[PDB]
């Protein structure tokens, strides 16, 4: 069981593929853009995964798959999974009480809560890597 094959223009890390996309998008349109590529906005679940993303991240910032779902107060990844790993900037997301709901990744890799209608130049998609057959 060796799964590290990724489509063209995707970078592998462990058992996932990652797409570092470009072009100005609001969070909801970045979300559609990943769905359109048979993926989804990235979910982050370890220090190791964050390291990898931080290395390939855009300095101008980028959308990730975490949002304050239906403004209920709890942050959930687009794939349905809960927050275990977190890499918040200092004070975040408590200092964000003016209606910020969508989470972006800075150049430093740190997460900050943003207004969902903010237009960012970058956004990250993920998906499972495919495996080479028992050959």
Numbering used by the authors: 158 to 292
Show the paper's wording.
The second principal receptor for IgE, CD23, is a type II transmembrane glycoprotein with a C-type lectin-like domain (CTLD)4 (3, 4). In its membrane-bound form, CD23 consists of three CTLD “heads” connected to the membrane via a trimeric α-helical coiled-coil “stalk”. The interaction between CD23 and IgE is critical in the regulation of IgE synthesis, which can be up- or down-regulated depending on the oligomerization state of CD23 (2, 9, 10). We have determined the crystal structures of the human lectin-like head domain of CD23 in its Ca2+-free and Ca2+-bound forms, as well as the crystal structure of the Ca2+-bound head domain of CD23 in complex with a subfragment of IgE-Fc consisting of the dimer of Cϵ3 and Cϵ4 domains (Fcϵ3-4).
As predicted from the crystal structure, the introduction of the S252A mutation did not affect Ca2+ binding, but unexpectedly, the D258A mutant was unable to bind Ca2+ even though the aspartate forms part of the apparently nonfunctioning auxiliary Ca2+-binding site. D258A (auxiliary) and D270A (principal site) crystallized differently, and in all eight and seven molecules within the asymmetric unit, respectively, Pro-250 is trans. Mutation of Asp-258, which faces Pro-250 at the base of loop 4, to alanine results in a conformational change in loop 4 and a reorientation of Arg-253 compared with the Ca2+-free derCD23 structure; this was seen in all eight molecules within the asymmetric unit. The side chain of Arg-253 flips ∼180° and projects into the principal Ca2+-binding site cavity, occupying the Ca2+ ion position. The re-positioned Arg-253 side chain forms two salt bridges with the carboxylate group of Glu-249. Occupation of the Ca2+-binding site by Arg-253 explains why the D258A mutant fails to bind Ca2+. However, the crystal structure of this mutant, in contrast to the other three structures that all showed perturbations only at the site of mutation, revealed that the D258A mutation (at the base of loop 4) caused a major reorientation of Arg-253 such that its guanidinium group occupied the principal Ca2+-binding site.
